[PDB]
Amino acid sequence: STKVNQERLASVVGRALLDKDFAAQLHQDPEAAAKGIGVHLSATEVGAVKSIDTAKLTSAGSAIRDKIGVAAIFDTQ
Amino acid sequence: STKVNQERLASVVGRALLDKDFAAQLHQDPEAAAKGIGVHLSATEVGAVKSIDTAKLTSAGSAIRDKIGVAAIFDTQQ
């Protein structure tokens, strides 16, 4: 689609919710951050991602970030 | 992976950030909400998803929800 590839956008903003360092990189430099994980944001998607307030995302994400991080380190197959 | 399939989890919580109604279905009934979009959450991922406060997620996502919603309706192919 031209403006919204909603599954690729979900991968990007979902990672931001799950990853404070990625969220911050994405807020500072969205097209480049998303390219680094293999996603192309349209100019529509870049402006939408910039409308995510980092403090508000941290407030929403801080609990799940902690819980998924502890699980990830020694995760098995 | 047993506990964390991080790309599938990102698809799920990313959709929640972008979709108030999905976020609410996921909070109420996480395993079934995720199955509905073809994701299997581990019990670890279910407890993790339950730790997303709906009001806090709405606060974080209200602006991007509005902006993506208006763009999506008449979106074209390239």
Numbering used by the authors:
A (entry chain B): 2 to 78
B (entry chain A): 2 to 79
Provide the authors' own sentences about this structure as they appear in the paper.
In the present study, we focused on one of these gene clusters, Cluster OS3 (consisting of four successive genes Os1348–1351 in the genome of Os17), which was predicted to be a bacteriocin gene cluster, and we constructed a deficient mutant of each gene. Based on the results of biological investigations, the full-length Os1348 protein may be a bacteriocin precursor and appears to be post-translationally modified into an active form by the products of downstream genes.
The full-length Os1348 protein was overexpressed in E. coli, purified, and crystallized. The Os1348 structure was elucidated by the molecular replacement method using the ideal helices mode at a resolution of 1.9 Å. The final model included four Os1348 molecules consisting of 2–79 residues in the asymmetric unit. Two Os1348 monomers joined and formed a dimeric structure. The dimer interface was composed of many hydrophobic amino acids from the α1, α4, α5, and α6 helices. Based on its three-dimensional structure, the free energy values ΔGint and ΔGdiss of the Os1348 dimer were calculated by the PISA website as −20.4 and 17.0 kcal/mol, respectively, suggesting that the Os1348 protein formed a stable homodimer in solution. Although the Os1348 protein was annotated as an alpha chain of nitrile hydratase, no structural similarities to the nitrile hydratases registered in the PDB were observed.
